[PDB]
């Protein structure tokens, strides 16, 4: 798993790899059904459902 901060992984003697997450893919819309909330599970989850 990758944190919002980022990962770094070394394999063998070879050169390290860096990794970072995007705003991942998807989940609802700017839609006619209200539904921005699953964009939340896109956009930095597990907090802020405390806010709703």
């Amino acid at each position: 798993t990758v944190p919002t901060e980022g990962l770094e992984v070394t394999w063998g003697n070879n050169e390290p790899y860096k990794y970072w997450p995007q705003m991942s893919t998807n989940g609802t819309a700017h839609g006619h059904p209200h539904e921005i909330i699953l964009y939340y599970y896109e956009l930095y989850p597990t907090m802020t459902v405390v806010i709703v």
Binding site: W20, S24, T25, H30, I36, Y39, E42, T48
Partner: protein, 439 residues
């Protein structure tokens, strides 16, 4: 004019710092540091190395009983044994049997390997701060090496940069560092002259040339048997030759924030923590007045493609009307979005594109171009891939980021029943105005 600013402490990420000045053509710069180096102090506590147990050939006194001589040796260990009986070429080395005694003595030294191979327990405290940076300065790629104190500044091409002092007092080390030849370890060593048995630092030296040696190994002799003409001893366990196997992991692979560890001298590389203040002094020989600057007007901005990723997130196109042919710069007036291309060529009545990135989907912003403010708006889309191997810190936005018309949605939600409880207060007080006269 001069200018004091703050950039976030990270590598490979440029930053557009504006220089606006009254009555003059503005000038933008871009910061991009390649290595910020934390260099700790150096104070050697003690070297350590692999020891060497030396015994000489053992003394034999038959028809006699030998005895030791006390001597300040590194782990002097002596013993006389009775009842022994050696064997060699011609049987017993001696003639009689029950009186043959053997004197034995053992001591320890350093090795020959301590000249070129050693570990060192080391005392290191709060660091300096060195840095190397690159600026594009009117199309001029300029490197700079500078220390982040406050007076090791730099003059390049009529440009005064001073960096530091670092706000981040955090360090990737402790007060106790052991180092060996390609790595360091944030370890807790035993002090000098109190080395444990069976531990690196059982033998100790202050320099690589200190003949005075501390030892704690217990080379305890044992009893040799009949014919076994030799010296039997309790083996001292090494420090190194299992401490090489009980390394754990170096600080190269457990440092926080991706801090690299170099050597000779040992230093932390790219410790991305916090932020750096940077001051720039550039005098007025380099500026231009606005009468010589091509000023533009009549801008129409639109964003035909925006994708809120960490990459070049979107391309907007803005129509301008230039007064004459020339060069001038662009910059955001909000810290959310950022703009890659610093300055741009303009000629007349034309348009130009610009690449930008952000995090917030409802991209509502303003761009300062060429001493002129322009307003823009769009709604973006999430990117369609999950991972990447490069960040860009426009995304670092709080909880007062800008949502969509979801703002208008939640504005619609907070309808409120204060009006109905207000008419409740009014109906109870019109009960109470039967007699609510002089309270």
């Amino acid at each position: 004019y001069e200018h004091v600013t703050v950039i976030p402490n990270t590598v490979g990420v440029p930053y557009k710092t504006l220089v606006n000045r009254p009555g003059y053509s503005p000038m933008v710069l871009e910061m991009e540091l390649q290595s910020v180096t934390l260099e700790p102090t150096l104070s050697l506590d003690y070297i350590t190395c692999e020891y060497k147990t030396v015994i000489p050939s053992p003394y034999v006194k038959c028809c006699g009983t030998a005895e030791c001589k006390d001597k300040s040796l590194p782990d002097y260990s002596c013993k006389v044994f009775t009842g022994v009986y050696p064997f060699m070429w011609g049987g017993a080395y001696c003639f009689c049997d029950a009186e043959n005694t053997q004197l034995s003595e053992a001591h320890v030294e350093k090795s020959e390997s301590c000249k070129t191979e050693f570990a060192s327990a080391y005392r290191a405290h709060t660091a300096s701060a060195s840095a190397k940076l690159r600026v594009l300065y009117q199309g001029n790629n300029i490197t700079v090496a500078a220390y982040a104190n406050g007076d090791h500044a730099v003059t390049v091409k009529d440009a005064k940069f001073v960096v530091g002092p670092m706000s981040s007092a955090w360090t990737p080390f402790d007060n106790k560092i052991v180092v060996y030849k390609g790595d360091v370890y944030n370890m807790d060593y035993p002090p000098f002259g109190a080395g444990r048995p069976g531990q690196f630092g059982d033998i100790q030296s202050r320099t690589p040339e200190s003949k005075d040696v501390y030892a704690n190994t217990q080379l305890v002799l044992q009893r040799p048997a009949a014919g076994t003409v030799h010296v039997p001893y309790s083996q001292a366990p090494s420090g190194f030759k299992y401490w090489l196997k009980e390394r754990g992991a170096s600080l190269q692979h457990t440092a926080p924030f991706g801090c690299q560890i170099a050597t000779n001298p040992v230093r932390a590389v790219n410790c991305a923590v916090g932020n750096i203040p940077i001051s720039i002094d550039i005098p007025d020989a380099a500026f231009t007045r606005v009468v010589d600057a091509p000023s533009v007007t009549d801008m129409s901005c639109e964003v035909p493609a925006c994708t809120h990723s960490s990459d070049f997130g979107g391309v907007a196109i803005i129509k301008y009307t230039a007064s004459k042919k020339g060069k001038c710069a662009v910059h955001s007036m909000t810290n959310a979005v950022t703009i890659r291309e610093a300055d741009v060529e303009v000629e007349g009545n034309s348009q130009l594109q610009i690449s930008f990135s952000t995090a917030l989907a409802s991209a509502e912003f303003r761009v300062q171009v060429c001493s002129t403010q322009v307003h823009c708006a769009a709604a973006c889309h999430p990117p369609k891939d999950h991972i990447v191997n490069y960040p860009a810190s426009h995304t670092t936005l709080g909880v007062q980021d800008i949502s969509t018309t979801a703002m208008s949605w939640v504005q619609k939600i907070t309808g409120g029943v204060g009006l109905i409880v207000a008419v409740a207060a009014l109906i109870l007080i019109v009960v109470l105005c039967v007699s609510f006269s002089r309270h």
